[PDB]
Symmetry: D2
Subunit: 282 residues, 4 copies
């Protein structure tokens, strides 16, 4: 994945047929290169319809998800493997090139105590099996580090890399998110540095999930460090103008992040494209 | 109105028993602070006279802070919240504290999955009006600390805190901001200070990862410049989660160390904050 | 002045008839509230044409200059007074509301040692005379602090305020410039703080004189501090893009500051207006 | 190959005379820096055996820096520049210095009034080629420091510095950046580091007003993150003009104190920079 993309919560709450149409049409208005589609209810996704829309409008895609509690990999690894296999198949069927996000646990997952080796061992077994299935469908898997309040297992670039190393697959990458790094990284550039050998995808998300350029993220540090490590993967926006219901409780958007998609896309995407030009990103 | 620099004593003591109070006051003297913030996990157990004597002997000012336990969350159990707050207010006053602050309007862990409602805010306002009257009768103030979306769904920004203060209509409730929470919640960190400017009397100076101030993602120059520009008169209180007791830490989503040790946090973070306060004239 | 404006150097440094027309046309294109008119040669300005242009287009204006060497106030105060009187009359007659800039000296002053009381006494005598003339024509005067390399006399907000106190006039204000403050102020907000009782005008200029938003100025600190002191004066964008070479060389522009006007105005003005909205200056 | 932390000796002495050398070396030991950077502005006046003995006695490494005097500006008087640089290189080597850096291609305060020309750059390239051979004969390297538009019109950015190193084609010339200069010249400070990454061996960590690092407008987190990202392994050196060498004062434009004294800059600035280097995993 290359260039600029948008997580489709910018435009649709649910990836149903009307929502897919609405999101793809909106993406065309902004000349982005790809979209990121939530894979939160895999049997409900009409893959033939989404593939038709993507190919007609010359858009690339990937999918992302968080695991439902019934299938959290850390404690119910057999259910997690079965869920990920279905999500991988649907991602591949619609033409998506990867399945990323919190593929190792829940959005809002917490035991109340620090993560344990038994949990990480379960996650490793799940991701090893999922990565084999992904290879059979020709897609990659991404592991997104999220903040301490959304998951207790993988919060930093360094923890994400440790899991990629624990699994020992060749088709799992690290996915970072500036909103999460703004909380978790001891200096935001350190997350990028720690993840550099595996970093293929980054959510350029403002500190309050609003408009990039108008929060507390350290954008100049972020873009300088991406340029320094030779980043050439996907640059994707993530702003919860709409909230997918299956993850709303974990994402904690209790008030509007911005007025509407026109504001976030009209002000945020030019800011990010201009910063990528300024620091010479590949 | 607290003045100068202080510290939240969690780095030495979250259980304010007799040895814990001595340990915390000894730390405050070591680091030469102007005041301490005393956590009240269990208000009834506090020895008010021992603490009062310690503060007076050492010319240390203090305030107290807490969050409501689930049995007393104001949004849903306002009668129980009033009863909890009355005990904490009396203990604060009797030990010589000048205010009770923190998440006095709810608890860590509140989340409905939807936006806060008028019904919830009505209950919070009734609780804070009763608590404010009790605090007035004991000659202290109350502070409302805005915390981030994941800890509570009701008061996350300076502007929401001010709206609640206006809803209650008391004269002795102020806004308490926290740079760690503002780093998530405010649309530009200075905007929390700007929105709260008529009521801001206290700020937690905490790094973005609860570690060492100066070494994270908080915008310290914007924070201190904006405090100076609004003419901030109030407590500058350092807050770090280093050495917090495990069960408290886990409740605040601390799953891994926030910093190497106290010598990193206090040896690097306190001078950073004092230097910034001098730089921008807050001193 | 209130709202947003532009220093017209991007279209005109020589305020002749076609230059005035070109600048007012640009002001309307970018929907600004006011223009800052450079006065390289005050005697040559057609005051009636400019006044009619401003009035017809509902545009407000102020003027600015730096003193030429024959009239540097620190050493040639009588000549400085004569030069300022002519500029003040031209400003008032064209409908301008203030004369600002380096009205206390010139670009290129440098003794090699710290500024002296004798220098400051001559400047104060000049500004006292000029302020009285300005008052008789109904306009104010602004003192722009500029960096150490351009002039050795007034570099910080606090130095500007000390000169306002030394003169004792009631119609002189402080004019700050983010490009100069980025060098001179010990934390950029401190220039605004120190000048808070007298600050009525600010040049919003990137650190390299290029595109605001894309440099090393601390824009969030600048706008938050302006909001916090209750700033109600002019927000004026300044960029050296397309400056006439002669003038550019005198300001040490040895290479392009930006790609073109489309970059500077198309990226820079929205950035600044968005920041002003974000922090409630509007 | 300088490494670790060092200080430009204007922190402590206005001239590198015998009393000034003793003062500066003594102060450097008090702060446990790894090296000092000695101005080479009056080469025939430097007592090289005295400085060598002090450095060797106190286990301190050193390099030298300069700006060319107008009589020997390389862009217009290249033969004089070569003769001046040969003397400066010889004295640097005699006192045990490992490199000669700074504005070795022109003046501090050099200005024609118009943009730089190819003929000026041809002269500089010829000078630097000849100087680089002499430096190799004495076993030291040369550094080219980009400085801002008001101090020199020829080399202002990392990218311009690299273009000159490539033009000269000598393998013993490195790029030397300075955060005070990059704060003005680089379109985003990290771009200077990125542009110079193949040749960057030395950086002045100098605050935006030449005062205390951490208390100005330099983007330190961006600076340190980008240094770490490019694998920087050279010298990290402070530059604060507590004292002003007279031969460059007019060009450096320090008209008012940059800070209270050296105790304030070293006491607050060096720990800040060391802590940032640790934070981003340089040191
Ligand atoms: O940032 C995230 C959740 O905090 C993830 O990026 C998540 O939103 C997935 O995309 C769900 O589609
Ligand atoms: O920031 C806070 C919780 O997130 C509060 O400051 C908390 O630490 C309590 O009041 C502790 O007394
Ligand atoms: O910033 C400035 C010079 O450095 C001034 O603003 C200058 O542009 C003149 O006054 C222009 O009229
Ligand atoms: O930063 C500098 C001058 O602007 C340099 O470090 C200067 O010291 C010369 O290059 C050597 O003095
Ligand atoms: O693919 C075009 C279309 O409009 O997409 C949305 C879907 O609900 C509609 O049934 C279908 O006709
Ligand atoms: O002046 C700013 C401020 O918020 O004004 C109101 C006052 O209660 C506070 O002490 C002070 O910080
Ligand atoms: O090297 C020791 C010493 O003190 O350094 C300073 C120099 O002026 C003195 O002459 C010499 O004795
Ligand atoms: Mg994300
Ligand atoms: Mg707090
Ligand atoms: Mg200006
Ligand atoms: Mg330097």
């Amino acid at each position: 994945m290359q260039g600029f993309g948008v997580h489709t919560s910018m435009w649709t709450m649910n990836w149903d047929r009307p929502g897919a149409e609405r999101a793809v049409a909106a993406a065309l208005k902004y000349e982005v290169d790809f979209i990121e589609i939530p894979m939160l209810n895999p049997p409900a996704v009409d893959t033939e319809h989404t593939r038709a829309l993507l190919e007609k409008n010359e858009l690339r895609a990937l999918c992302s998800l968080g695991l439902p509690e019934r299938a959290w990999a850390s404690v119910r690894p057999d259910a997690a493997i079965e869920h990920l296999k279905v999500a991988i198949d649907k991602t591949a069927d619609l033409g998506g090139e990867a399945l990323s996000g919190v593929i190792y646990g829940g959005i809002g997952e917490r035991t109340g105590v620090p993560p344990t080796e038994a949990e990480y061992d379960n996650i490793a077994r799940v991701l090893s099996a999922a990565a084999k299935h992904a290879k059979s469908r020709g897609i990659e898997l991404g592991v997104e580090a999220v903040n301490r309040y959304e998951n207790h297992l993988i919060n930093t670039g360094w923890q994400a890399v440790q899991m990629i190393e624990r699994v020992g697959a060749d088709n799992i990458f690290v996915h970072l998110d500036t909103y999460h790094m703004n909380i978790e990284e001891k200096g935001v550039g350190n997350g990028i540095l720690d993840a550099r050998e595996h970093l293929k995808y980054i959510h350029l998300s403002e500190s309050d999930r609003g408009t990039p350029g108008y929060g507390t993220c350290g954008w100049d540090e972020i873009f300088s460090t991406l340029a320094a490590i030779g980043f050439k993967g996907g640059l994707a926006m993530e702003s919860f103008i709409n909230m997918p219901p299956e993850v709303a409780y974990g994402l904690a958007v209790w008030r509007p992040v911005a007025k509407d998609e026109e504001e976030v896309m009209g002000n945020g995407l030019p800011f990010l494209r201009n910063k990528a030009k300024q620091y010479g990103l590949i």
